[PDB]
Amino acid sequence: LGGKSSGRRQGIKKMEGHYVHAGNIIATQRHFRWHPGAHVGVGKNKCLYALEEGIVRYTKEVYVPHPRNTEAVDLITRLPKGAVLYKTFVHVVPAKPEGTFKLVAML
Amino acid sequence: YKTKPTHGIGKYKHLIDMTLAESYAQYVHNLCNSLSIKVEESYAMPLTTHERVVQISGLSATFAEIFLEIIQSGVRLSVXXXXXXXXXXXXXXXX
Amino acid sequence: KFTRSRIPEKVFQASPEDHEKYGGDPQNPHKLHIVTRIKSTRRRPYWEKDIIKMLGLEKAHTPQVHKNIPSVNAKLKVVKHLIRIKPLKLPQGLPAEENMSNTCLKSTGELVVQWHLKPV
Amino acid sequence: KPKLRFIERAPLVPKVRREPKNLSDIRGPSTEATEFTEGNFAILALGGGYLHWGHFEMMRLTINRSMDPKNMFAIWRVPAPFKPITRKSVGHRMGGGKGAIDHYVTPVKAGRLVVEMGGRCEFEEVQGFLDQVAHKLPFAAKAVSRGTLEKMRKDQEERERNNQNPWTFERIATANMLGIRKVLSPYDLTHKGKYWGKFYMPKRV
Amino acid sequence: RRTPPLGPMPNSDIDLSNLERLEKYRSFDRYRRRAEQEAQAPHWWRTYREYFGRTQQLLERKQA
RNA sequence: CAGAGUGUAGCUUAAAAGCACCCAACUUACACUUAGGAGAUUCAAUUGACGCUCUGA
RNA sequence: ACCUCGGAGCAGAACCCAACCUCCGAGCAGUACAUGCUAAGACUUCACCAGUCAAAGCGAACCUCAAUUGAUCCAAUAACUUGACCAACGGAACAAGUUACCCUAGGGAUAACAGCGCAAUCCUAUUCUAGAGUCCAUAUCAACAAUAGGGUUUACGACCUCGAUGUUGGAUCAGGACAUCCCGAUGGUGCAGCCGCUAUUAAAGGUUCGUUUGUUCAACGAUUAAAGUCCUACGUGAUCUGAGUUCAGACCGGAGUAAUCCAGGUCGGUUUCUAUCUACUUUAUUCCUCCCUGUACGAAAGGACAAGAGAAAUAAGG
RNA sequence: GUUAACCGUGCAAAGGUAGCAUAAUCACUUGUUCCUUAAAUAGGGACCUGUAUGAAUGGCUCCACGAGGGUUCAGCUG
RNA sequence: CCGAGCCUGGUGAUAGCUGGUUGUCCAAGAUAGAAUCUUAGUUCAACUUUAAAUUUGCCCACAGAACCAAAUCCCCUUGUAAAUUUAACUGUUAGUCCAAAGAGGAACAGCUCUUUGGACACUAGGAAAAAACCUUGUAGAGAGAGUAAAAAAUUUAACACCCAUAGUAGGCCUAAAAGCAGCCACCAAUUAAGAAAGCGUUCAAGCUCAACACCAAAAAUCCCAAACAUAUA
Ligand SMILES: [Mg+2]
Ligand SMILES: [Mg+2]
Ligand SMILES: [Mg+2]
Ligand SMILES: [Mg+2]
Ligand SMILES: [Mg+2]
Ligand SMILES: [Mg+2]
Ligand SMILES: [Mg+2]
Ligand SMILES: [Mg+2]
Ligand SMILES: [Mg+2]
Ligand SMILES: [Mg+2]
Ligand SMILES: [Mg+2]
Ligand SMILES: [Mg+2]
Ligand SMILES: [Mg+2]
Ligand SMILES: [Mg+2]
Ligand SMILES: [Mg+2]
Ligand SMILES: [Mg+2]
Ligand SMILES: [Mg+2]
Ligand SMILES: [Mg+2]
Ligand SMILES: [Mg+2]
Ligand SMILES: [Mg+2]
């Protein structure tokens, strides 16, 4: 016997060049098929979401793990002396500027 | 992405008396490190007597000879069997 | 699994031999295509059905005139096995407002303006 | 020790995992053991097939029987029967899970050199028993020397170059002309014509 | 469809025949430095920067 | 004792740098880390004259 | 056997994707006790219900984990809250057998007979030369294997028929195939002769009666020239039988608390049709006797063919 | 353990006693043998792994009787 | 017509089951999934119809969509014309073969189960007859015209002639084992003949050979169009 689990419907919900508002989920995954980049967050599922209004872009950026997170550090240590890991990152490149000074009155 | 020219950019898996004796062992280890040889392991084996080990693998005859000479140049040695003298030490090889 | 087939780009490159065989020149390429539906959409994938309709190639053997450009050529490439294509080559000058009425596609794809049914 | 060693049925450490019959391991040209490695003669598999233990045994035996021992040697170039075949208990109905592993087999493709022979040679001498062996095998096979193989290859090349038929299969396939890729497989771009299933057509090109 | 890389891929030269001969960054700091250097360098794959971004005197000094 | 290549501390499409290196402490030891340590344009106005490497006698 | 949930393969590159397909597991733990309030904007197990993520703000500091769960109404609670292996896991508030004593509606959407597909199994023929055959692969057997063909078997499938098509045997009558059991004509022989074995060709003609037995079968008795292998809805119930066997009664053994069951046994147990239509309803074999002959052949034992003559038998027609 | 009287050992409530037995008695099953037949998966008589016999679920004899079910001598008869 | 009578009434009982549903003409119109005492049904979804409002819809091009093949997604131009939303609904929700990628099963099935794409359930022409292969779709009349798909090919096993002396019945091993039971060596005389490659010998012998000289079918009613190699694609 065994289990028949339903499809999980995970993956990218927003592709490069899409206009993504603050809060929109960008990509859902188990493990990191993509990582959070500029203005992109991570939920408890590892799901990536936009932190600002703007455009999604994908990039392959050098990956440095946090010192406190042990396993990654170990892996890094293991690598040979000219090696760099690299990983894919999702950014939102913000469109509308946060601020505009308007004239209230002439006092 | 697979079909993109940046395919395997993330790929990483493919890249990955007693006191005196102790001191001597340490020195030997250091020397090994310097000369670029695999130091596998070291032991703390049991008047009194005390033994120390420095397990080594892979070294060419000339280089090996040089290493031996340096080691020679106290206590004792034991690895052809190459013993010498000035607790105990035993640098077991695997050339 | 049967799929929407993508053709390698070396397939669409004319050799000197090819040029010799046919009429066209590599410099001064023809502006327009006469595209005719010679084969039925029935029994072909729905995307091919769509493409034909988008080109307006509904009546077989009735011809349409399409710009020769990358955009139009991509569609044409999709249904190339359903269609016959030939260059619209105008021996006389292209139709002015006086000669809009009198024209004739003919065979050999040439548009004509001086169309009198009397012989030479 | 120049003689065909024992190729025993099953692997000693067996596999409990039932492998789902991927027939692709028969189909197509052989990626692996195509070109000679220090045998001068061989048995060239022209068609794909699953070599049973019995076949292996036969091949071992016959060659041994006709092996000039001091002069000649013989190599195995197919591995031992590692693909498990499952068969249900006799006459039961469809369903109720997968069958039980009955035996093991070796996948072989067209192009694979099944057996190699080498040493002080007599062309005739080798051909006789190797041809017999080939005949015995469950696919179309050929007793083949190095030189002969080379010649064959050359001939094939010539054919490829020569043909006065303007339309090759390859051209029709890749260029998609007609709606013919609707009829063809996606493997009929890699194999082109030639290969139909386990079978192979040396003549057509 | 397998496209070849446009320029040279990273991690090409350092893998080599053998892994056990090399130095490896036993530390993190070195690795970090390397990463920084890489970042500073341009690359062909867009990437962050695309989308967002006397002798006498000496002697005297020494003496001092 | 006659020629050629030259000549930043171990080493560099460095220009007084960065890598290497040493001591102590943590370490069985190595490793990491933390404290410290030491080092250089061979010398006189691009030219000459001291030091090597190399080839002759 | 399974029925809920999760991970991996099938399903190789945005999701999605089945099977009584292949493989792992879960129905918990551990740390907290701001696992405080709220709230833009999204995702969503292809519906709904259930799930998920979450900026800012206000309050405070300075969650881990894959699955680890369950609706409503009802209960229990001052209230906050808490209630099912409701595990058939979208859950009926609480439900078992048996029925050859059975009934109704349906179904060829689902079986038994029959057909049909396939051919695993089965039967045959080639190829191959391992090995038996005092030697000698091919007089004769025949391993490992390979390449074809058949549709006797038991299956598998579920395509026609459930507003039925009557199911094992046997009688009657047979049409056909030959893959020849007999009767001819040949080739080989490990064929002297007699008897054989094997191979090619041949389907005119023929292919026994009994005991037992439901039976095909099987065994035995006597024969014979031979006592063929099969196909035709297991040829043929509007020609027959009904011995089995598809029901109602009954026993014996067993199973079951019991009704009642058993691919257990045994006694009994109604077989209906007046023919509308097609179709159809007067075209020689063989054994034995005698002679040859007690000749050929053989060392002897035994022991022939062909040619001839005579008697019979069956079949057909009088 | 010694076909086994007998021994060792366990479980049980009692441990199938007399009798009868290839039967109207799961199968193996044409059980084995004597009689019957030219020939007997039939019938009769014996034997017993009946692993599924058996005592008013009545067990075992046996006189008469039975359109009950089997076997048969003789005669007879299309 | 007794597993529980018959009659009347409740009773037009109830049926997810079967059967049946009657004037004309036109138009649009096909089977992603869910749960479910549920798979002979249902209710959501999906597809479908109508009436609205609308702005984008399909085709898509560079960029882009992890690590442990075919392709797809996204997608501006462009070819086109519609798609999204609102308002009302019913009905399909027991499917088949072909091509392709797989799975189970026999690498069986007109077998079973997914996915992608065709076709059919809707006319026609073809493939003999034909659902699912191929050509072909928008309609009617004509005693007009050009076309498409569209008609299977084969035919096969000869082969040499001559001449064969020696050291040598090599040794070692074998009762004997002479070119040929199995090993070691394989040397050499004349032009030229292997210390022998098949037979064959109890062992010898004789036959040769190597060498010189000479130069594809087989099944059960009765074969199955008739036929035909030759006047110009
Ligand atoms: Mg949803
Ligand atoms: Mg916050
Ligand atoms: Mg009864
Ligand atoms: Mg009763
Ligand atoms: Mg009924
Ligand atoms: Mg049916
Ligand atoms: Mg039907
Ligand atoms: Mg033999
Ligand atoms: Mg015959
Ligand atoms: Mg009757
Ligand atoms: Mg009848
Ligand atoms: Mg009676
Ligand atoms: Mg019995
Ligand atoms: Mg009788
Ligand atoms: Mg009693
Ligand atoms: Mg009475
Ligand atoms: Mg009603
Ligand atoms: Mg319509
Ligand atoms: Mg089917
Ligand atoms: Mg079906």
Curated annotation (Swiss-Prot), chain A:
It is found in: Mitochondrion. The keyword Translocase does not apply. GO terms for molecular function: RNA binding; structural constituent of ribosome. The keyword Signal does not apply. It comes from the Eukaryota. One of its GO terms (cellular component) is mitochondrion. One of its GO terms (biological process) is mitochondrial translation. Keywords: Mitochondrion, Ribonucleoprotein, Ribosomal protein, Transit peptide. Belongs to the bacterial ribosomal protein bL27 family. Component of the mitochondrial large ribosomal subunit (mt-LSU). Mature mammalian 55S mitochondrial ribosomes consist of a small (28S) and a large (39S) subunit. The 28S small subunit contains a 12S ribosomal RNA (12S mt-rRNA) and 30 different proteins. The 39S large subunit contains a 16S rRNA (16S mt-rRNA), a copy of mitochondrial valine transfer RNA (mt-tRNA(Val)), which plays an integral structural role, and 52 different proteins. This is Large ribosomal subunit protein bL27m. The lineage of its organism: Eukaryota, Metazoa, Chordata, Craniata, Vertebrata. The gene is MRPL27. The chain holds residues 42 to 148 of 148 of the full protein.
Curated annotation (Swiss-Prot), chain C:
It is found in: Mitochondrion. One of its GO terms (cellular component) is mitochondrial inner membrane. Signal peptide: none annotated. One of its GO terms (molecular function) is structural constituent of ribosome. The keyword Ribosomal protein applies. It comes from the Eukaryota. The keyword Transit peptide applies. Disulfide bonds: none annotated. One of its GO terms (biological process) is mitochondrial translation. Keywords: Mitochondrion, Ribonucleoprotein, Ribosomal protein, Transit peptide. Component of the mitochondrial large ribosomal subunit (mt-LSU). Mature mammalian 55S mitochondrial ribosomes consist of a small (28S) and a large (39S) subunit. The 28S small subunit contains a 12S ribosomal RNA (12S mt-rRNA) and 30 different proteins. The 39S large subunit contains a 16S rRNA (16S mt-rRNA), a copy of mitochondrial valine transfer RNA (mt-tRNA(Val)), which plays an integral structural role, and 52 different proteins. Belongs to the universal ribosomal protein uL30 family. This is Large ribosomal subunit protein uL30m. It comes from Homo sapiens (Human). The gene is MRPL30. The chain holds residues 35 to 154 of 161 of the full protein.
From Swiss-Prot, chain D:
Signal peptide: none annotated. GO terms for biological process: mitochondrial translation. It is found in: Mitochondrion. Transmembrane segments: none annotated. Its main location: mitochondrion. One of its GO terms (cellular component) is mitochondrion. GO terms for molecular function: rRNA binding; structural constituent of ribosome. Keywords: Mitochondrion, Ribonucleoprotein, Ribosomal protein, Transit peptide. Component of the mitochondrial large ribosomal subunit (mt-LSU). Mature mammalian 55S mitochondrial ribosomes consist of a small (28S) and a large (39S) subunit. The 28S small subunit contains a 12S ribosomal RNA (12S mt-rRNA) and 30 different proteins. The 39S large subunit contains a 16S rRNA (16S mt-rRNA), a copy of mitochondrial valine transfer RNA (mt-tRNA(Val)), which plays an integral structural role, and 52 different proteins. Belongs to the universal ribosomal protein uL16 family. This is Large ribosomal subunit protein uL16m. The lineage of its organism: Eukaryota, Metazoa, Chordata, Craniata, Vertebrata. The chain holds residues 47 to 251 of 251 of the full protein.
Swiss-Prot record, chain E:
It comes from the Eukaryota. Transmembrane segments: none annotated. It is found in: Mitochondrion. Component of the mitochondrial large ribosomal subunit (mt-LSU). Mature mammalian 55S mitochondrial ribosomes consist of a small (28S) and a large (39S) subunit. The 28S small subunit contains a 12S ribosomal RNA (12S mt-rRNA) and 30 different proteins. The 39S large subunit contains a 16S rRNA (16S mt-rRNA), a copy of mitochondrial valine transfer RNA (mt-tRNA(Val)), which plays an integral structural role, and 52 different proteins. mL38 is located at the central protuberance. Belongs to the phosphatidylethanolamine-binding protein family. Mitochondrion-specific ribosomal protein mL38 subfamily. This is Large ribosomal subunit protein mL38. It comes from Homo sapiens (Human). The gene is MRPL38.
